[PDB]
Design a protein around this ligand. Sequence first.
Ligand SMILES: CCCCNC(=O)[C@H](C)C[C@H](O)[C@@H]1C[C@H](C)CCc2cccc(c2)CS(=O)(=O)C[C@@H](C)C(=O)N1
Length: 376
Amino acid sequence: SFVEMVDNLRGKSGQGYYVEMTVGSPPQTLNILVDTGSSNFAVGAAPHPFLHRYYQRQLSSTYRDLRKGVYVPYTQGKWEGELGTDLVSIPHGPNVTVRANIAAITESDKFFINGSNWEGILGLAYAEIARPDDSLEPFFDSLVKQTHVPNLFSLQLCGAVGGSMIIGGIDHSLYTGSLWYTPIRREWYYEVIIVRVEINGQDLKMDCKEYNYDKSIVDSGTTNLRLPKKVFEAAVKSIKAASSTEKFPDGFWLGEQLVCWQAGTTPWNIFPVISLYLMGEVTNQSFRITILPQQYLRPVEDVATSQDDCYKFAISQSSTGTVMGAVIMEGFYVVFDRARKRIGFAVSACHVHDEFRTAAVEGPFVTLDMEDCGYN
Ligand SMILES: CCCCNC(=O)[C@H](C)C[C@H](O)[C@@H]1C[C@H](C)CCc2cccc(c2)CS(=O)(=O)C[C@@H](C)C(=O)N1
């Protein structure tokens, strides 16, 4: 029955991927952003300039008020609202209905995106980071407790825009090759441990603790690859060196300004591949995922005279650890195997294409002392 969930996502990396859901009785349809970087299920519940519809609690006969407030601050953006519960379904998901916690968003700050086509957010991470505290059961925990849906989901994010969220399993038609698994270090964010970084085959040769300072997470709700300061500087220095035969606007490397080239003349060959080595399932063993420049040069429309191919640099500096965002997940099939406390990666069936290079998931590799790469 997973074929019913193939192609159930819409959206893009820059504005997120969303799945259709219904809340309440009678069902109210809403588009919900898929966010593995948080653990609250929340929906716009009051008028907002960027919302075309919102959750109307007074129209749902199964709505229950929890008489408790809530607010969630993200890396960028935040909202506040009122907690309650209601019946929730996923039309192109498992054929079930669950009573779930819902934060009714009443005010927000730089959270909703104009023209994104989504009205709420589905935090798929663990209760430890739920607000106001870990006693607010997240949606996926409610789903597993109330139904026989297995305790895992997988995401196929396809760039360009859509993809698939397979709830309760793995759909083998969505990937090629083998799945390689990295342990979930701790159940709060989807925290992983990066054990080596290479750019065009050259090791960054940093203390691997730097790659996970102060954590590394997998986050479908973040567009970019985000790197801690020291790692970001080394990566940008290496990427600049590899591409120095081209001139880039002021602020391109800050992700602010955009770069353009005549239609179909983007010099892909001058931008390096990035290899992230992740801790494996067995002692002293890792695997690597290889990222092409078509992933970290995010294509954007040219509102001006749309003739050229324009892009933004989709790697940015972080002060809260590494974030493997949507541009990293695109082109891979990512399995959030909560039951076995592991995350799997495989080459996606909707993978990015370069003329001479290819995104890859490869292993095994030997990596000694991987335990020292985790931050404490
Ligand atoms: C309180 C406990 C949990 C908190 N979790 C977090 O804050 C996560 C680490 C980050 C989250 O996934 C958040 C979730 C965001 C706001 C959802 C809206 C969205 C979708 C796609 C792209 C962008 C924004 C632009 S963007 O710039 O990429 C935002 C990135 C920077 C962002 O904040 N994404």
